[PDB]
Amino acid sequence: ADAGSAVPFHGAHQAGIATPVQDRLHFAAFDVTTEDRAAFVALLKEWTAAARRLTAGHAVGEGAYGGLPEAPPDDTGEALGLKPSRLTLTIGFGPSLFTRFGLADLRPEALADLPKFPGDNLDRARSGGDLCVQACADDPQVAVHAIRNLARIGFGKVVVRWSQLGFGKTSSTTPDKQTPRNLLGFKDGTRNIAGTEKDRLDRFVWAAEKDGTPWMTGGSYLVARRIRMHIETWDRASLQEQEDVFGRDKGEGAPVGKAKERDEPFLKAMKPDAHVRLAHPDSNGGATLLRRGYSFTDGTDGLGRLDAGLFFLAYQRDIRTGFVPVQRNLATDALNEFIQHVGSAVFAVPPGVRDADDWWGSTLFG
Amino acid sequence: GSAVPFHGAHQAGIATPVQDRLHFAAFDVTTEDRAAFVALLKEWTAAARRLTAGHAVGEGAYGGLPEAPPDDTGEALGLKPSRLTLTIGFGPSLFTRFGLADLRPEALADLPKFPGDNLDRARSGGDLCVQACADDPQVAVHAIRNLARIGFGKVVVRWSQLGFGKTSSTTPDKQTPRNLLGFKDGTRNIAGTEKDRLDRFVWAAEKDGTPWMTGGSYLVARRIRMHIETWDRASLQEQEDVFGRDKGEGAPVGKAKERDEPFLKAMKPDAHVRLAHPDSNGGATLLRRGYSFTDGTDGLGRLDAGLFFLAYQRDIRTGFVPVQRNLATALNEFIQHVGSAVFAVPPGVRDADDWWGSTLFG
Ligand code: HEM
Ligand code: HEM
């Protein structure tokens, strides 16, 4: 999809995972406030109909104006005149959802609670959530409009628990395109899974019927981690230290000793605690992740410095065999000196909306 | 890759085309040493020359001595200049330092308290500001991040605000952007093409009484939160009554097209456009150059969003103050001013030997 165009909303999988990574992110986690299973199903269907309009660049409901003068417009209007901008909307269900609506026995085993990791300082207010909507678009206003209108449609049935805006991507599903840099100045996304690698996506990303939870076939599992960066500490590190931390050089992003970004890492030349060496599939029994995160900055830290961070998003076939073993291996990561995980959540991302009659979560509910 | 010339009689970023993104930072000065601060302005000017041309600051982001921290933090490598402009301004509190008290312009007036103000001290004020605008937010953020790093030990960041306007890769150029209330925003503004109106309403002139400010301007910044969820429950007629323009076309009530000149008597008496219009304010006219923001959601699940309002004018006492005073009475139901600062924005950097603030510090 070129700039401005729409990303197809229907498919066997939800868009927004293997889709090329859009420039902007608006991630919202919602808690459910209704106990009425029928009312929540009706919300899912109303949300699905809204998403069809939004991802096509159309206003929700009857439109943003022209209705009865005395009624609030159905669409809040601030995306009027804008292109779809590659908007994708990806819904996920958190483990806490399954304490409601009789869903207990339907919780996927792959939707594992994450253990505590060393160094965690998780803010419980910006963690968890019954469900999430990841809105990705090339235009921040398009992404905000989608989240705001979904929240407004859901009034009385869901409330926003927390949200995170990402001002630029730090990830790549398109190795044919330039790899974006994170706020530490390193390319981020070189060795990820590409949207064209159908076999790798089947192996590492999509849930299969044989994995034990039939309603999740074709979905995925999402781990979100809000990671603060100690940029004061990083920025006084020498160039050699920074490159040692990762195992790739800063300018080209090539593995140490090699000349080109996409040359294969030779792990034994990296320091034993180098990030790439510790996170590489070959260090983790083959565990492989689809990374899809974004940078953020939320003002200052009150101590005279810019706040900076990375909103880490990983998709995987099974949280127990993707993020958990890799993150456990990062216990000795040289990068730990410069980061702190401050928020966390996991979600089961259901399969795609197959056609115009289908709806988000229809295989769970149905 | 489009770039905006850094040098000029005026700083860029004021009359030059409005870029898609904003990173605004207010800094406090932590040194008492005038010479050290002047040294900093020169290094900052050298860095700004590099940044606005799309080059790394100093010796670069890599390829130097391995034992040294790189001069540039590296996260804009591979990106375009993205029309980056960097505009510096000096707050009233700066003039209590360095012996400058008698050089504060009278046009750099303290703002009165206005009805409904709910100003957060931590997001207000500041000894100086850097307005970084660019089409790529990572270019803007990189600029602020590196200027702050270069200044470490002499300045700290007091507060910062990210914002967005239109996305120009997808949105036509003669299309007015919409603010987060869904209304076109910017129809009746001073355009950068209007040289005469800029001279009359925006640029400080030497006759105004502060010679070092000639060719500069005065900036008012207001962080204005919108009560989004309340606004979204209002009727379309209520929303249009608040502004005096229709929501779809943005035409003044009773007219057909967005750029039809308004008939103020057809608007309700406390409609925003009627109260803000120059005809209601003795001719007072502003250059608005603000950006929307959405910082997330507050503790009650509400959208922390609004307008980071920026107004440039020849004299704060005859620009923002009389217009904001006249807004004392229908948009106020839906907004709250929660941060404020004023800055004297000096004249432009004339050439490669000149530096930010040279007319003030000599
Ligand atoms: C602020 C936090 C982080 C930063 C700045 C960061 C940065 C990087 C960089 C610069 C690379 C090399 C380029 C690339 O292949 O993408 C990389 C690779 C990688 N990272 Fe991270 N990372 C962070 C967090 C994490 C976390 C939390 C995980 C997993 C739990 C992770 C897993 C990986 C993986 C799997 C790779 C690819 C390794 C390979 O196969 O070669 N990263 N990261
Ligand atoms: C969140 C806050 C605000 C919003 C959403 C808002 C919105 C608007 C809109 C929709 C218009 C009509 C279209 C246009 O000509 O731009 C307008 C006009 C205008 N506004 Fe505001 N505004 C806000 C705050 C302010 C403030 C604080 C001031 C000055 C103190 C101001 C001064 C003006 C002026 C001078 C005009 C042009 C009036 C004319 O000459 O026709 N606005 N604004």
Numbering used by the authors:
A (entry chain A): 52 to 417
B (entry chain B): 55 to 383, 385 to 417
Give sentences copied directly from the paper behind this entry.
Here, a highly sample-efficient methodology to measure serial crystallography data from microcrystals by raster scanning within standard in situ 96-well crystallization plates is described. Structures were determined from very small quantities of microcrystal suspension and the results were compared with those from other sample-delivery methods. We demonstrate that raster-scan serial data collection within crystallization plates can be an easily accessible and rapid method of assessing microcrystallization experiments and determining suitable-quality room-temperature structures.
DtpAa crystallized in the monoclinic space group P21, representing a much lower symmetry than was the case for HEWL (P43212) and making it an important test system for the general applicability of this method. Data from an additional 27 drops were added to provide a much higher quality data set (increasing the number of merged diffraction patterns to 22 854), although a total of 35 drops is not very efficient for screening if every tested crystallization condition requires 35 drops for low-symmetry space groups. More amino acids, water molecules and alternate conformations could be convincingly modelled when 35 drops were merged (22 854 merged diffraction patterns), although these were removed for the 12-drop and eight-drop data sets (10 054 and 5360 merged diffraction patterns, respectively) where the electron density was not as clear. The resolution achieved in the fixed-target experiment was 1.78 Å, while the in-plate data from 35 drops reached 1.79 Å resolution (22 854 merged diffraction patterns). In previous structures free of radiation-induced changes (measured with 10 fs XFEL pulses) the Fe—OH2 bond length has consistently been shown to be ∼2.4 Å and to progressively increase in a quasi-linear manner with accumulated dose until the water molecule is at a distance that indicates complete dissociation from the heme subsequent to reduction of iron from the ferric to the ferrous state. The observed Fe—O distances of 2.6–2.7 Å in the structures presented here are similar to those observed at doses of 75–100 kGy in experiments where a sequence of still diffraction patterns were obtained from each microcrystal in a fixed target over several tens of milliseconds, providing a fine-grained dose series. The dose delivered in this data collection from crystallization plates was approximately 18 kGy per crystal (and hence for the full data set as each crystal is assumed to be exposed only once), which is significantly lower than would be expected for the observed Fe—O bond length when compared with the SSX data. The doses calculated for in-plate data collection appeared to be lower than suggested by the electron density, although it is important to note that time regimes and sample environments differ from those in the previous fixed-target experiment.
